[PDB]
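Section handout, structural biology tutorial.
Before the tutorial, make sure you can parse a SMILES string by hand: atoms, branches in parentheses, ring closures as digits. In the record below the ligand is calcium ion, and the chain has 673 residues. In the tutorial you will relate the predicted structure tokens back to the input. Do not try to memorize them.
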Amino acid sequence: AALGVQSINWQTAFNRQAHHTDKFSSQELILRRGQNFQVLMIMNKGLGSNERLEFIVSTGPYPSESAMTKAVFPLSNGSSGGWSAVLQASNGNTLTISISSPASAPIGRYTMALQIFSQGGISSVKLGTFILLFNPWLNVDSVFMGNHAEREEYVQEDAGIIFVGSTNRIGMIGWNFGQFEEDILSICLSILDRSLNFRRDAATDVASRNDPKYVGRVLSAMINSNDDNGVLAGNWSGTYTGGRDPRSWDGSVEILKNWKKSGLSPVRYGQCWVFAGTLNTALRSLGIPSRVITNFNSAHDTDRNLSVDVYYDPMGNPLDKGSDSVWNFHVWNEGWFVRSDLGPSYGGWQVLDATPQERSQGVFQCGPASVIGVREGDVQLNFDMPFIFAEVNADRITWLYDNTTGKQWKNSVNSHTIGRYISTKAVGSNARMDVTDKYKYPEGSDQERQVFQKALGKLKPSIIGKLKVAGMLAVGKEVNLVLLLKNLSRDTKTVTVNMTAWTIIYNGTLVHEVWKDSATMSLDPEEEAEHPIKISYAQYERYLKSDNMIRITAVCKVPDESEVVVERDIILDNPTLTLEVLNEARVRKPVNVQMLFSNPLDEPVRDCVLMVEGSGLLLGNLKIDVPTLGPKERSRVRFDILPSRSGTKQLLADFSCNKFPAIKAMLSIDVAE
Ligand SMILES: [Br-]
Ligand SMILES: [Br-]
Ligand SMILES: [Br-]
Ligand SMILES: [Ca+2]
Ligand SMILES: [Ca+2]
Ligand SMILES: [Ca+2]
Ligand SMILES: [Cl-]
Ligand SMILES: [Cl-]
Ligand SMILES: [Cl-]
Ligand SMILES: [Cl-]
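Predicted structure of the complex:
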């Protein structure tokens, strides 16, 4: 009889554990390139000295041998670089074979077939399929990361921390990456097959999937719905009807599944941190080390001149007159891999930004831009460096503009306000790691100034005031501020002060005026004076968005002297929302929990909905309609979860009602067994 395969044992458990891919929920064979995996092949008979077995693996719609998208290797006794199969042992009709792929093979879904040379003929049989990923464990992979604690953080951790807020107050929100949850690895893998790149040339695209630079750049474009039927639809208008408030999401799992579920239709709606969270899920899942970055006072330079303009009018109103803009904070990603296109000194952390801000080559893509390449001002390298350098170190010019005259005049120039407290989640804890010293030399140092000009080169007052917050700021309470002025001149002057308060979206989008007042006064030389600003709930609640932010502005003008702009954005807290466990948590055993919320308003809160999720704690997102809560009343929603994996797990919740959109809550649970 002719030689044939009776059956094949992929030893999925073993290989996956050895390939550090066992955390995935899938049942498939998940492997990482450049590493060996052993399989058992029971043949109908014993192997002959004159018989031969050729293994055939292929990926994508055009398996090409010369494109590395297809490979055919013989079963030998020795080993050959790249794909190869080695007969380690032969017992009975069972063959113990060790297969190995090349560290430079393309990632993605594969198909394995067998070609058998026996008794004068040749047969072929499909053997199965397995998924192939990047290998941060392999010293020769592009994505190699030597440190254990680090790799675990940037590849294996499915729970995260994203810093938000403003330079006056840094906060954080929990985010569920859920890269190991069901269908998540598959959906990400399917993204690469939906990109514009693939549609433009599937053959060349699948062949380029052996490069993290390519894969990351493709994801930076595909995670946003712009241009390619991507995943997320952005919206910074402050009104998200027909979708979900950008601040209500808690993870990437429901965003990616909804995407696949709605026939790859835009998921509405998202903002920078949502994009970053999803993009970061796509990366850690494919095997590319990654973390999320928050840059406070992020600038958006449009005319590539390393300068951003912000306008105001004589009345003290913020103005949306410039194509450029300064966000209170912007969140993006950093992938880890060697840049063989830039040179040995530019490998390491690379920047990837899926937020649709600037087009690159016509489409909304961004990265990779070596972070090392950014600090030295080498903006001539790919990709999108002039733009990225501008987010972290552009100069802020403040303009005065009176529309009644069409006149416009520079007010000042700040070369240190932009790019501050650049944070990322610490390794193995929730501590805030500041990586600013990584994106630039110290503000206020000659080097920072020297590099700025280097980069630019490649692309080419009697009164002083400060606004002081008084008492806590929380949605429902009144806001109290204090304009502090002082006359530093030897002369007694008369100063006119125009103040305004506008609710805003963190990106700077002005929403609506909630307060205004004027005040003329005479200050003597060295005399200090303070003006009280008071804004009731009634006034701002009407136009306050889920950002809970207000832009306070005071424009002080003294006769014949230039104007003086005193500015300060404030963040109003949400009435606390608490999470609590009602017993000790153990794997596969129910764990009782409860949500707690007190409504501080004199009016009830209706349309209450609770959202809970957490990788390893629940499967998906738990939705709960909450009964309307009266004024000063307390809500106590009970529910259970069933821990599926042990360790420090993250429980995230979202509480939304008519007077309080997206209140967040987070609890770190320790699951035993
Ligand atoms: Br290199
Ligand atoms: Br303050
Ligand atoms: Br604040
Ligand atoms: Ca897109
Ligand atoms: Ca500019
Ligand atoms: Ca600077
Ligand atoms: Cl290893
Ligand atoms: Cl999957
Ligand atoms: Cl770092
Ligand atoms: Cl946590």
